């Protein structure tokens, strides 16, 4: 850190969000639109 | 920076305490 500058981190991790992204690929590939 | 985490007075009065990246030997139970 420099001087009096911060960085938060993201609540969602980069895994968190590729676990959601599979999760809307897998209900469409299964179930059309209807788990929507 | 440092935060205070807290349930609310109206359930408790325990509080924790973040100090944000910093490494936790220099800080100055449950660390
Ligand atoms: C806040 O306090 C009131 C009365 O003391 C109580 O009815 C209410 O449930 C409390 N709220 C919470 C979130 O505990
Ligand atoms: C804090 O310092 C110790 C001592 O060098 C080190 O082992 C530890 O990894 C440091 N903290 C982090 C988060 O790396």
Same mark, same amino acid.
């Given at each position: 850190k420099?001087? =009096? /500058?911060?960085? /938060? *981190? *993201?609540?969602?991790?980069?895994?968190?969000? %590729?676990?959601?992204?599979? %999760? /809307? /690929? %897998? =209900?469409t590939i299964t179930s059309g639109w209807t788990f929507g | 920076g440092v935060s205070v985490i807290t349930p609310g007075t109206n359930t408790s009065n325990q509080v924790a305490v973040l100090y944000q990246g910093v490494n936790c030997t220099e800080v100055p139970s449950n660390v």
């Amino acid at each position: 850190k420099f001087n =009096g /500058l911060t960085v /938060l *981190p *993201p609540l969602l991790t980069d895994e968190m969000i %590729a676990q959601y992204t599979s %999760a /809307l /690929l %897998a =209900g469409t590939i299964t179930s059309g639109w209807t788990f929507g | 920076g440092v935060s205070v985490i807290t349930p609310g007075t109206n359930t408790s009065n325990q509080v924790a305490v973040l100090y944000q990246g910093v490494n936790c030997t220099e800080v100055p139970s449950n660390v």
